[PDB]
């Protein structure tokens, strides 16, 4: 869904965040976004 | 009517061209910048290019996942294989002159994930440490048996060769005027 | 050159054959030469076929043998020495003529002619097994029939 | 028919490439790559009547066609290596890419 | 057309290309019969004719 992770263009992934927050962050790359 | 004479004064310098598949050329009609190379890395006889780049800090970084998983920070390498072809000279343009030099290879830069490749090396190391459970004499080449060659033999020779950490500079007026003074 | 090789195999003769040697002790044992010249005389001594390449598991290891049985196998041509090397590497349990044919690529005539010449030179004896009978197992004259 | 859509675009290619040839006269460490036809059986980029370019790179061998044609959303940078030593310098980025093709 | 180049083009011009050229590309891919016993013996096929 246009989920490009810049500097790798790989993917994004809704990850289980702190206090249950719905953060999105991919593997194989140190990246995060609200 | 008008005519712009070109001549070919370039030798002795096997200059390469890269292609960043990650960063765009222009951003909202505005031309972008190139990121600053920390150091370069070149493998002769296999023509690889492990260009290192830094990625920016905590604000868009998420170090708490980067530190605890692979313990490798602030370094994003990207592998480029040197591919050769004919034609395709490189031209810098003078006022009513245009001066050519041959391009030796064109390598294409893909994001080489180094740290999570190596995160399974200690994981493979710890496999046989939790499960430790356990003579080199010559033989003869037989003419009814074959040996590996071609594609997979070139990967056996491209992992073990000399590292070179390149002193990356940005000069190039020495390369310019040396070409200008030669006809 | 050759005088340091006379000091090198003295260290191989210094210890009784067990407790097999390796380089990280041998560099501390002998460090008068740098490793650019230590390796060159050992490869020359591999060409003087007195040092062998033993394997302790997964890593690098050496073993030096007696000279009195090194000239024994240097009497043979390289094919007879090729079958002799595997047949002492088993040693304690023996080898089967099919296994000694597989690891060398020598086909059925050139291995059967090889050991027949080797038996006249008193270098291989033939025993029959009991854990699997009707199979030809060969050994040296060490006489180690643990089966 | 649709071949008449081609020649008018090749006219619109020359008027876009004489612009980028002329804005880069200020030698501002600017590079461009273009391909020459090898296997020869030097010359001069030159303007004809009413917007037409050609090169004649042999003694006689004319190459009429040129075209400023490709699309790349990439970063492309030229570097010169020398003898695998302290020989790493980024020369410049690449603005455009044209091609040369002989007429038949 | 049919004088220089008849009606059994497809049969005659195929076998005639096999005999002339397409035999020499066979023995050049099965040359050098060898033995492992007595390794100084070699027989090679240089060329072939019908
Ligand atoms: Zn990513």
Curated annotation (Swiss-Prot), chain A:
A zinc finger (C4-type) spans 5-29. It is found in: Nucleus, Nucleolus. Zn(2+) 1 binds at residues 5, 8, 26, 29. Belongs to the archaeal RpoM/eukaryotic RPA12/RPB9/RPC11 RNA polymerase family. Component of the RNA polymerase III (Pol III) complex consisting of 17 subunits. DNA-dependent RNA polymerase catalyzes the transcription of DNA into RNA using the four ribonucleoside triphosphates as substrates. Component of RNA polymerase III which synthesizes small RNAs, such as 5S rRNA and tRNAs. Involved in Pol III transcription reinitiation and RNA cleavage during transcription termination. This is DNA-directed RNA polymerase III subunit RPC10.
From Swiss-Prot, chain B:
It comes from the Eukaryota. One of its GO terms (cellular component) is nucleus. One of its GO terms (biological process) is transcription by RNA polymerase III. It is found in: Nucleus. Transmembrane segments: none annotated. Keywords: DNA-directed RNA polymerase, Nucleus, Phosphoprotein, Transcription. Component of the RNA polymerase III (Pol III) complex consisting of 17 subunits. Interacts with RPC53/RPC4. RPC53/RPC4, RPC37/RPC5 and RPC11/RPC10 probably form a Pol III subcomplex. Present with 1590 molecules/cell in log phase SD medium. DNA-dependent RNA polymerase catalyzes the transcription of DNA into RNA using the four ribonucleoside triphosphates as substrates. Specific peripheric component of RNA polymerase III which synthesizes small RNAs, such as 5S rRNA and tRNAs. The RPC53/RPC4-RPC37/RPC5 subcomplex is required for terminator recognition and reinitiation. This is DNA-directed RNA polymerase III subunit RPC5. It comes from Saccharomyces cerevisiae (strain ATCC 204508 / S288c) (Baker's yeast). The gene is RPC37. The chain holds residues 71 to 262 of 282 of the full protein.
UniProtKB/Swiss-Prot annotation, chain C:
Signal peptide: none annotated. It is found in: Nucleus. Changing residue 79 to A: Cold-sensitive. Abolishes interaction with BRF1/TDS4. DNA-dependent RNA polymerase catalyzes the transcription of DNA into RNA using the four ribonucleoside triphosphates as substrates. Specific peripheric component of RNA polymerase III which synthesizes small RNAs, such as 5S rRNA and tRNAs. Involved in recruitment of Pol III to the preinitiation complex. Involved in the configuration of an initiation-competent form of RNA polymerase. Component of the RNA polymerase III (Pol III) complex consisting of 17 subunits. Interacts with BRF1/TDS4. Belongs to the eukaryotic RPC34/RPC39 RNA polymerase subunit family. This is DNA-directed RNA polymerase III subunit RPC6. The lineage of its organism: Eukaryota, Fungi, Dikarya, Ascomycota, Saccharomycotina. The chain holds residues 11 to 157 of 317 of the full protein.
UniProtKB/Swiss-Prot annotation, chain E:
Present with 1950 molecules/cell in log phase SD medium. It comes from the Eukaryota. It comes from Saccharomyces cerevisiae (strain ATCC 204508 / S288c). The chain holds residues 51 to 100 of 1149 of the full protein. Belongs to the RNA polymerase beta chain family. This is DNA-directed RNA polymerase III subunit RPC2. Component of the RNA polymerase III (Pol III) complex consisting of 17 subunits. DNA-dependent RNA polymerase catalyzes the transcription of DNA into RNA using the four ribonucleoside triphosphates as substrates. Second largest core component of RNA polymerase III which synthesizes small RNAs, such as 5S rRNA and tRNAs. Proposed to contribute to the polymerase catalytic activity and forms the polymerase active center together with the largest subunit. Pol III is composed of mobile elements and RPC2 is part of the core element with the central large cleft and probably a clamp element that moves to open and close the cleft. It is found in: Nucleus.
């Amino acid at each position: 869904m246009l989920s490009f992770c810049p500097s790798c263009n790989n993917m994004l992934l809704i990850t289980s965040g702190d206090s249950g927050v719905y953060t999105l962050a991919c593997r194989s790359c140190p990246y995060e976004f609200p | 009517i008008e005519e712009f004479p070109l001549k070919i004064s370039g030798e002795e310098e096997s200059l390469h061209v890269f292609q960043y598949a990650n960063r765009p050329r222009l951003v909202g009609r505005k031309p972008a910048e190139h990121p600053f190379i920390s150091a370069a890395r070149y493998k002769p006889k296999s023509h690889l290019w492990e260009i290192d780049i830094p990625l920016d800090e905590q604000a868009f970084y998420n170090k708490d996942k980067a530190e605890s998983e692979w313990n490798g920070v602030n370094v994003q390498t990207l592998k480029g294989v040197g591919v050769e072809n004919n034609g395709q000279y490189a031209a810098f343009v003078k006022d009513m002159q245009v001066y050519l030099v041959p391009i030796e290879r064109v390598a294409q830069l893909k994001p080489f994930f180094k740290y999570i490749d190596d995160a399974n090396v200690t994981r493979k190391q710890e496999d046989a440490r939790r499960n430790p459970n356990p003579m080199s004499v010559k033989s003869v080449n037989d003419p009814s048996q074959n040996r590996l060659t071609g594609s997979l033999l070139a990967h056996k020779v491209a992992d073990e060769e000399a590292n070179i950490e390149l002193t990356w500079a940005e000069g190039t007026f020495e390369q310019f005027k040396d070409t200008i003074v030669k006809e | 050159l050759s005088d340091n090789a006379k000091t090198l195999h003295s260290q191989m003769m210094s210890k009784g054959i067990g407790a097999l040697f390796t380089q990280q002790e041998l560099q501390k044992q002998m460090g008068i030469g740098s490793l650019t010249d230590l390796m060159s005389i050992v490869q020359e001594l591999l060409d003087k076929n007195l040092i062998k390449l033993v394997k302790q598991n997964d890593e690098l290891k050496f073993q030096g043998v007696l000279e009195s049985e090194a000239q024994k196998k240097a009497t043979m041509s390289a094919e007879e020495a090729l079958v002799y090397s595997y047949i002492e590497a088993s040693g304690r349990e023996g080898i089967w003529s099919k296994t000694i044919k597989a690891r060398t690529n020598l086909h059925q005539h050139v291995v059967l002619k090889c050991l027949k010449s080797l038996e006249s030179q008193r270098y291989v004896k033939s025993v029959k097994s009991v854990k699997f009978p009707t199979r030809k197992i060969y050994m040296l004259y060490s006489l180690q029939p643990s089966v | 028919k649709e071949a008449a859509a081609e020649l008018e675009l090749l006219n619109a290619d020359h008027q876009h490439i004489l612009r980028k040839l002329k804005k880069m006269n200020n030698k501002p460490e600017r590079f461009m790559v273009f391909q020459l036809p090898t296997r020869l059986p030097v010359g001069s980029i030159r303007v004809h009547k009413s917007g037409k370019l050609s090169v004649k790179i042999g003694n006689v061998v004319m190459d009429i066609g040129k075209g400023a044609e490709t699309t790349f959303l990439q970063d492309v940078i030229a570097l010169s290596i020398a003898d695998d030593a302290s020989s790493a310098e980024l020369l410049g980025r690449v603005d455009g890419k044209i091609v040369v093709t002989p007429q038949i | 057309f049919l004088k220089v180049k008849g009606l059994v083009k497809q049969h005659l011009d195929s076998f005639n290309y096999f005999v002339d050229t397409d035999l020499k590309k066979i023995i050049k891919a099965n040359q050098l019969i060898l033995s492992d016993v007595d390794p100084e013996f070699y027989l090679k096929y240089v060329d072939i004719r019908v």
